[PDB]
Amino acid sequence: KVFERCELARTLKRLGMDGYRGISLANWMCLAKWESGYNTRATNYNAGDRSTDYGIFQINSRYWCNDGKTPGAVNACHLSCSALLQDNIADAVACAKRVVDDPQGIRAWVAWRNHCQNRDVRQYVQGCGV
Amino acid sequence: KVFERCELARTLKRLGMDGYRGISLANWMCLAKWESGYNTRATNYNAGDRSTDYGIFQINSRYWCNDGKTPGAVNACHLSCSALLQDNIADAVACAKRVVDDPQGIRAWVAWRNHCQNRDVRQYVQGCGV
């Protein structure tokens, strides 16, 4: 499923993301845009370390979810990576929350550091009524 | 099912968890948060002793439930582990109560010792009307 911008904004808001760990809804939106283009089925296999990023937030199988095929992996979200490839994003949202509860917060995502951090992101939520 | 925070709090209170063996509702909430993110379908395989943790409270197959795949296991809750992956959490609540009946109580969960014990956990029930 590819979310439309405002559709995603309302969904994330409904799922308790707006201000979670001091992270605005617009920031979560910017993260989803740059990671997956709002695509819940997105996957990115890294031949380098044989890990894969899953779903709308591109969560990595080396540390966060289990795909049963990543060397030296842990499963900190206690969840199958397939749960992060579903149209219903509740599991993905729960796991993203777990990620930012770690010390480095949303900076865990290099794409967010590069394309969102310190920048204007107001346009992600503009006109969504959230 | 992935519970919303306040929905889970009210559900646990309804199932008689608040004050069970001296354990506050907020402590059960913190446990669930750091085990599964309130996800009834969470699982975690432990290569160490070939056991798996099941469900919202991440209850282990070596001692507490039967998954038919864990060597030398016992089934103290008298439940198949599949019952602990269901939307209805009555069985999971009954099993968590049984776990904390043992001498170490809630300290059985290492995630709880690391993320909850001795810390302020009022945030977990704030605004829930419980």
Domains and CATH numbers, chain B: 1-130 (1.10.530.10)
Mark whether B4 is an active-site residue: no
**A109/A91 Cα distance (integer angstroms):** 18
Is residue B106 within 8 Å of B27, Cβ to Cβ? yes
**A92/A103 Cα distance (integer angstroms):** 19
Taking the CA atoms of chain B, what radius of gyration do you get in angstroms? Answer: 14
**A58/A39 Cα distance (integer angstroms):** 10
Quick one: angle between helices B5-14 and B25-36, nearest 10? 130
**B128/B130 Cα distance (integer angstroms):** 6
Query: Helix, strand, or coil here: A54?
Result: strand
Give the resolution value in Å: 2.0
Beta bridge partners of B20: B23
Element containing residue B94 per DSSP (H, E): helix B90-101
B110 min Cα distance to partner chain A (Å): 13
Is residue B59 within 8 Å of B53, Cβ to Cβ? yes
| Residue linked to tokens 């990671």 | A35
CB–CB of B36 and A75 under 8 A? Answer: no
What is the DSSP secondary-structure string of B18-31? TTBTTB-HHHHHHH
Taking the CA atoms of chain A, what radius of gyration do you get in angstroms? Answer: 14
CB–CB of A66 and B45 under 8 A? Answer: yes
B54 min Cα distance to partner chain A (Å): 9
Discontinuities in chain B (C→N > 2.5 Å), after residue:
none
**B103/B110 Cα distance (integer angstroms):** 15
Tokens of A49: 């370390």
Tokens of A32: 């989803």
